[PDB]
Amino acid sequence: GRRGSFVEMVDNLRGKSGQGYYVEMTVGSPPQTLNILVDTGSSNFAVGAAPHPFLHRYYQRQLSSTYRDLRKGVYVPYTQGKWEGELGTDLVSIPHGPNVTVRANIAAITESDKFFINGSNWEGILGLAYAEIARPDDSLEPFFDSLVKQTHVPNLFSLQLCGASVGGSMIIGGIDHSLYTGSLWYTPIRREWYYEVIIVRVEINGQDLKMDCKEYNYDKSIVDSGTTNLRLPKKVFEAAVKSIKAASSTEKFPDGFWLGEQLVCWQAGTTPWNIFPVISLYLMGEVTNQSFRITILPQQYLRPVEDVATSQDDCYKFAISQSSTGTVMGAVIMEGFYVVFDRARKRIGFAVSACHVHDEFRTAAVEGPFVTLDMEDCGYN
Numbered sequence: 001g002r003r004g005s006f007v008e009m010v011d012n013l014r015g016k017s018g019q020g021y022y023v024e025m026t027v028g029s030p031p032q033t034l035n036i037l038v039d040t041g042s043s044n045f046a047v048g049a050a051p052h053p054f055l056h057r058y059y060q061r062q063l064s065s066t067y068r069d070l071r072k073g074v075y076v077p078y079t080q081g082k083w084e085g086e087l088g089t090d091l092v093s094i095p096h097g098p099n100v101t102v103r104a105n106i107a108a109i110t111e112s113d114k115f116f117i118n119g120s121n122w123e124g125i126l127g128l129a130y131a132e133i134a135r136p137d138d139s140l141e142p143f144f145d146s147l148v149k150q151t152h153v154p155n156l157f158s159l160q161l162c163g164a165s166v167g168g169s170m171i172i173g174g175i176d177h178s179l180y181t182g183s184l185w186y187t188p189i190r191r192e193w194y195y196e197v198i199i200v201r202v203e204i205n206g207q208d209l210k211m212d213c214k215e216y217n218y219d220k221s222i223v224d225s226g227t228t229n230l231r232l233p234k235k236v237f238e239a240a241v242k243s244i245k246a247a248s249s250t251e252k253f254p255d256g257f258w259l260g261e262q263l264v265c266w267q268a269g270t271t272p273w274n275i276f277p278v279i280s281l282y283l284m285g286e287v288t289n290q291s292f293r294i295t296i297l298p299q300q301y302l303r304p305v306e307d308v309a310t311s312q313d314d315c316y317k318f319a320i321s322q323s324s325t326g327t328v329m330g331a332v333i334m335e336g337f338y339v340v341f342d343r344a345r346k347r348i349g350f351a352v353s354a355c356h357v358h359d360e361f362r363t364a365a366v367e368g369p370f371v372t373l374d375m376e377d378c379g380y381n
């Protein structure tokens with residue numbers, strides 16, 4: 001397709017619960033196939049390049065006639081573990097994506113810790129965010145930037161994350177209208193580094209948290225397909241769970257559950273969804289003093305934990321958790337919505353996902369417009 005319909009790319013995402021969403025890619029000539037995690041929270045294209053025992057397969061540079069060494073390394077630490085690699089370029093394509101082949105930067109991973117997941121079916125990570133947060137620096141052109149520069153692929157992508165096997169769609173260079181219902185609503189990308197946005201108001205079951213909105217974006221709010229949780233700043237988390245506790249006080253659960261220190265189980269088929277509140281985030285709109293509201297269900301924040309071998313019941317993780325890095329709108333948010341990363345226009349569109357899991361009483365929602373004053377004061381500097 002060219003606009004509005006891209007049958008080729010529908011259902012091009014796979015994964016497992018809690019292990020993220022991956023797309024099939026090829027690197028080098030002749031083409032080497034790899035499953036690659038779709039990550040809007042980073043900016044490196046990095047692939048396994050050595051026989052780590054967890055890996056189904058890895059990039060074999062020796063086999064590629066189109067491979068070029070940049071004679072430079074890159075060391076990428078995170079909070080939990082790291083990866084390290086050798087920088088180069090090669091020909092990269094997406095079999096179930098646009099019908100093109102691009103020369104892109106590839107970090108050939110040669111050492112890692114707590115990076116590859118044991119039992120997962122991906123071998124690398126596609127950083128979809130901007131050069132500003134690329135490693136080692138902003139001169140290493142991210143994949144999507146190389147894609148847009150070298151081809152006629154429009155400067156946007158969209159994500160439908162569907163939620164042991166998960167599915168979804170990454171529509172590269174377009175939007176597929178079958179993937180959502182109702183209207184897209186757009187929030188401005190504040191700065192092109194992460195996919196930074198501003199949260200303007202928070203409601204639990206319709207009840208405003210009544211916090212200084214500056215808190216909601218302390219020090220950052222981002223959209224991140226490479227994180228499971230809805231992550232909230234601790235002050236906001238405290239307030240949020242306090243209200244979530246109140247709305248659900250029809251039942252009691254240990255404190256640890258709310259901190260994700262323990263899991264909570266119900267007997268098969270009898271999860272009290274209705275005891276749990278909806279969560280609504282108001283996002284800055286396109287227009288001065290105008291906002292919109294996205295609403296998620298317990299279906300989104302209470303996640304099935306499948307691999308619990310010491311229990312026979314239906315066990316769940318509370319997937320809202322505190323943070324030091326700001327708000328992270330991960331899979332918990334994105335699984336409710338069709339999300340349009342409108343890079344050309346510096347904006348992010350949300351619409352009700354045609355695939356989000358709901359019940360017969362409550363649906364995920366995108367609603368507007370609303371009148372919100374002082375939305376700029378919600379940003380942090």
Ligand SMILES: C[C@@]1(c2cc(NC(=O)c3ccc(C#N)cn3)ccc2F)C=C(CF)OC(N)=N1
Binds near residue numbers: 019021040042115125
């Ligand atoms: C570069 C990475 C990253 C992300 C992941 N992501 C996942 O493993 C993962 C798991 C489940 C879901 C879901 N749903 C999404 N991503 C793995 C390794 C990894 F290094 C680092 C962080 C933390 F700082 O956050 C983001 N967005 N990306």
